[PDB]
Amino acid sequence: VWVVGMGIVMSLIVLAIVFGNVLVITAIAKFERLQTVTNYFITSLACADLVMGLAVVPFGAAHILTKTWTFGNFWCEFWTSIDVLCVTASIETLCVIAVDRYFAITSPFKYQSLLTKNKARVIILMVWIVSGLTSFLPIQMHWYRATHQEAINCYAEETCCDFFTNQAYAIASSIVSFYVPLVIMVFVYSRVFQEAKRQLQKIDKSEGRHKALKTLGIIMGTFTLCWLPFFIVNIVHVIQDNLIRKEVYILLNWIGYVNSGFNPLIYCRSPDFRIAFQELL
């Protein structure tokens, strides 16, 4: 009375993610007026979200609904690697976009000199490579493997897939993937807000006879509310093994997945994108 209908939500999420990401990619690729150095970061972010929505989500949905993993252990390890890869790549691309905006507003004359067409490709490749070294290299060689008896029983059996991780791997991965980008983005947006307030005050002083707050609020709040509650419990549940159950962890992780769907509605609402979308349909 629950399974026969609760798959509708997963189907809707999959459809929304795939449609939004493919529409953004098609709009950027097809029309030449959208070709910009800043738009390449959005292209990489959309590609990461598309891969996530095409691979990670359906298999997880099958895992919860069926409650068994029909496929082998090799596919389980591959799925975990893809999950970690996509998550960290997306979160790092967000910080890259924020730093680009910081450089755009803070230093207006030499914005062009710092970043060109060729440098963006190198930045994106380095971001994806650092993302890859976090997931595939440790998982495939079995560095994260736990040691307690329940983990051994889960790992030996070929029909169960429960994520058991070492303390050191969890801490290092969380620090590399979330907290450093969080700090960088906070500092960047604080400086940007200060500059905007100064300019607004200058204009009001010039023309003798509030708006950036909402713009910063959407971007900060969406990311923080979507990805902060997951990493708190991720860090906590390794130090103490009795506080956090195995269902709240899954619920928070799936809450974090939805953040891929909201990215096109935040970073791709410019008017030129509106003309591009209107022309397509």
Ligand X SMILES: CN[C@@H]1CCc2c(ccc(O)c2O)[C@H]1O
Residue-wise burial string across 102-133, b where 16 or more C-beta atoms lie within 10 A, e elsewhere: beeeeeeeeeeeebeeeebeebbeebbeebee
Q: Does 177 interact with ligand X (rule: CB under 6 A)?
A: yes
| Dihedral sign, Cα of residue 72, residue 74, residue 77, residue 80 | negative
CA distance 147 to 101: 45
**Of 21-29, 171-179, 200-208, 213-221: span binding ligand X (CB under 6 A):** 171-179
Cβ atoms of residues 188 and 102 within 8 Å: yes
Q: Any binding-site annotation on 83?
A: yes
How far is it, in rounded angstroms, from Cα 269 to Cα 263? Answer: 10
Positions 189 through 218 that interact with ligand X (CB under 6 A) = none
Closest distance of CB 61 from ligand X, Å: 13
Segment 94-153, which members bind ligand X (CB under 6 A)? none
219 makes contact with ligand X (CB under 6 A): no
Q: Which of 155, 163, 164, 193 lies at the binding interface for ligand X (CB under 6 A)?
A: 163
The interface region with ligand X, picked from 11-19, 117-125, 166-174, 259-267 by CB under 6 A, is 166-174
For helices 3-30 and 259-267, the axis angle rounded to 10 degrees is: 30
Buried b (16+ CB within 10 A) or exposed e, 14-36: bebbbebbebbbebbeeeeebee
Q: Does the protein bind ligand X through residue 80 (CB under 6 A)?
A: yes
Q: Which is nearer to ligand X, 50 or 120 (CB)?
A: 50
> Which phi and psi (to 5°) does residue 160 adopt?
-130, 140
Among 44, 81, 83, 92, binds ligand X (CB under 6 A): 83
The residue (of 88 and 263) whose beta carbon lies closer to ligand X is 88
Query: Taking a C-beta distance cutoff of 8 angstroms, is the pair 233, 248 a contact?
Result: yes
Based on the shown chain and the rule CB under 6 A, indicate whether residue 253 belongs to the binding site for ligand X: yes
Q: Could you tell me which stretch among 38-46, 81-89, 109-117, 271-279 binds ligand X (CB under 6 A)?
A: 81-89
Determine, following the binding rule CB under 6 A, whether residue 52 of this chain makes contact with ligand X: no
Position of minimal CB gap to ligand X? 173
Site membership for ligand X, residue 93 (CB under 6 A): no
**Binding residues for ligand X, total number by CB under 6 A:** 11
Contact status: 73 vs ligand X (CB under 6 A): no
Residues 6+ apart with CB under 8 A from 266: 218, 219, 222
Residue ranges in contact with ligand X by CB under 6 A: 80, 83-84, 87-88, 163, 170, 173-174, 177, 253
